[PDB]
Subunit: 111 residues, 3 copies
């Protein structure tokens, strides 16, 4: 039917940990991720993306090629619809945060 | 025909390195990556995924929509098969580690 | 026409914060990203990839399965041309930097 994307935030801190004999140290990463990151559609069909923002703050969802640029508030849901009338690969990104904190995804429009 | 995915772990620490005049300082990133992250199939076909675990620890490979939940031991290869009976975009993730340490991928089932 | 990929570097340092009583340890993330990261093409396609390198350093673009392996200088734009003669999923990666700094992408054929 329609796509389902969940936006999650992760605050990871692992000073030291032995995982199956392997010790990992000084890990510190904070990120926001769109799950899933990639969406593939056929050129022409209308797209419906139900974005559920589970992040503690407002998150962005943009796709330049199709004038898509929304802002979903914390704990809110938002259906984003548009028509992929152009072929190619387009970056799905958050216009609100650093791109290497809230990692971008991809909208692929096949011929 | 048959997908090939390699799971790799990276333990990266760079105190300070000047590359072509640009300073790359205080880098500390630990991640596990599925190479490649995205698999694109068509609704209906029988998917075959040969997953080779090059990570020094056990790694997970999960895709809820198709009941896929596997653990690949360090240095082992496991072929994962399932039918993509439904269209859409589904997250490929590890159920053992933090999603922003072991970055997730996507299974795209197209009509 | 063809694919347009922009390569960007992110040098991100964020001091410790306290958001709604919740403390967030200082963050430090340095990455290089291909935007877009994924390319889906039909088998037998004469793929054209215009790669604009916005990174301040040389960036690599490789896809083993098709002999693709180029080095794009900082600020330059290079067009990659090859034919996707094989179906499957192939990693788009940079042979110059650690894979978890410059995150890999994917070339999907059919
Ligand atoms: Cu964001
Ligand atoms: Cu993992
Ligand atoms: Cu690079």
């Amino acid at each position: 039917h329609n796509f389902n994307v969940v936006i999650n935030a992760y605050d990871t801190t692992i000073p030291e940990l032995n995982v199956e004999g392997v010790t990992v140290k000084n890990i510190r990463a904070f990120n926001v991720l769109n799950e899933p990151e990639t969406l593939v559609v056929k050129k022409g069909d209308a797209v419906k993306v139900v974005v559920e923002n589970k992040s503690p703050i407002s998150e962005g969802f943009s796709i330049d090629a199709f004038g898509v640029q929304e802002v979903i508030k914390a704990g809110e849901t938002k259906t984003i619809s548009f028509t992929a009338d152009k072929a190619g690969a387009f970056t799905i990104w958050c216009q609100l945060h650093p791109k290497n904190i809230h990692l971008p995804g991809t909208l692929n429009v096949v011929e």
